[PDB]
Design a protein around this ligand. Sequence first.
Ligand SMILES: [Zn+2]
Ligand SMILES: [Zn+2]
Lengths: 239, 239
Amino acid sequence: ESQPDPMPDDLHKSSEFTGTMGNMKYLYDDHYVSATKVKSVDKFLAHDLIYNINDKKLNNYDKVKTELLNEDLANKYKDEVVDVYGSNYYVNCYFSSKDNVGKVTSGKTCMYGGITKHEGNHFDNGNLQNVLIRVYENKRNTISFEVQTDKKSVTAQELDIKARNFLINKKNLYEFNSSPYETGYIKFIESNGNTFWYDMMPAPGDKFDQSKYLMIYKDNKMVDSKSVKIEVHLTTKNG
Amino acid sequence: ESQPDPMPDDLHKSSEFTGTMGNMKYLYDDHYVSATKVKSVDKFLAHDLIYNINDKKLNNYDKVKTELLNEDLANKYKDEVVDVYGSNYYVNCYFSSKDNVGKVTSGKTCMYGGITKHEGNHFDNGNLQNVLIRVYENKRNTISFEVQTDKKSVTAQELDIKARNFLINKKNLYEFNSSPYETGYIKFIESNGNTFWYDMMPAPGDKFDQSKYLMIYKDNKMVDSKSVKIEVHLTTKNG
Ligand SMILES: [Zn+2]
Ligand SMILES: [Zn+2]
C-alpha cells in the first residue's frame, strides 16, 4: 500500500543544480500562508479553489488560490469551513484566463493543498501537539527536535515547512548560492503502516521553477499528528 | 505513494483451495457487527480494544474485541466515541491469556479494524451516500450497482462487506463447495491518487483460517465515501 525508500539515483543532487539555491530557501524560511475558519469564494480552473486570505504582517495579498489534485478533491472542500497552511509563490501565478505568461502577480498569491477541516480537528484543552523530527546526517542520528501543531489531522505540508525552517537556521540546509548537503529527503511514517517521502533538493539545471516544485503538496496529504513519525535523511557533499 | 495492480501470480486461485468455500461465504453473507456511539472499556493485548457490543437479533455476543495494526493505532481510538462496522469470527477468538487454542468462544466475538469517529462524520440532512461499484467479468463491465453509507469517512471494510454480500446473492460469488470464479480482487481508488486492492479468494490448501484472512482490515483503512471509486475484477473458471 505504501511507497518504498529512494534508490541512489532517485534523488536530486544539489551539485547538478547550477542555479540560485536562495529560490528554494525563500519557500521555507519564515514563509507561509496561514488562514483560520475560511470558506471557498470562487474557482479559476476545475481542480482549484480561490480564498479571501489577507496578509497581516506584510500585506502582500488579499486573495489566495490553492490547486488540488483534481475536481473531486476540490469539490470535497468547496463549501467547507477550513483552515489553511502552506508555502506560497508569486512567479507564474494565475487567477484568470486573461493572465500572461511570466506573471509576477500583485496582491494575489498561489499555493498547493494545505487544507484541513476546522470542525473537530483541535485538541480538547486548547493544547499544542509536539511532533518529533529525527535528523540523520550520513546515516548517523545527529540531532532531534520538535515542531508544534494545533491540528489532530495535519497536512504533511505544514510539518515539512516547519521542519525545513528550523533546519535552514540550525544546519544551514539552504543558503543563497548552494547547500552543504548533496542529497536530502523527508520521510513520513504513519501509524497505519503507510510511508512516503519528498525530495528536499531542486531538479538539475540552471533554473528553479517554484510552482513546479511545490506540486508535491497537490494531493493534500494528511497525517495523524499524535502518532506520525518523521525522519530527515541528509548526506554531506564531502563524505 | 500507492500500491500497483496485481500480477497474474499475485492472486489466489480458487481451484487451488481444496477446502469448504462456505467458510468464506459465511463471513460476507448478511454477516457483520454494527455498533453506534461506543467507547473502549478494556484491552487484551497492546494492539487491541475490547467493546461492550451486544447482538440484537441473534444475541451471539455482548462483548467484541477488535485488533488494530499496533499500539499507536489502538491508543488513537482508546478513549474516543466511535461507530463500529466489520466482519466477525468465533474460531480462535481469545479475550484472555487463560484461553486455550481452538477456542470457539461463547458470548464474545472477534474482528479487525472497522472503527470510525462518531463526531462530525455524518451527512447534514441525515441522508445516505450512494457508492457506485463497477464489476468486471473477464475484463468486461457486466454490471454496476450501489451500496449505501451514513459516514463521510468510512472504512474500506464496510464497503467491501456490502459489495460482496450483494455479489454472493446476484452472481453467486461464494457457494458452499466452490466458486464460479477462479480469481477476484476489489480495488479502491481515492480522490487523492492512492489506490489499493484486496484478494477475494482464500489461500491454497484444504483449510481456511478466518482470523488470518480478515487481517487485511487490521490497518483500519478509511476512504472518502463521496469521491472513492471501487472496481471488482473477476475471471471465470472457464474462459
Ligand atoms: Zn480551526
Ligand atoms: Zn455515528
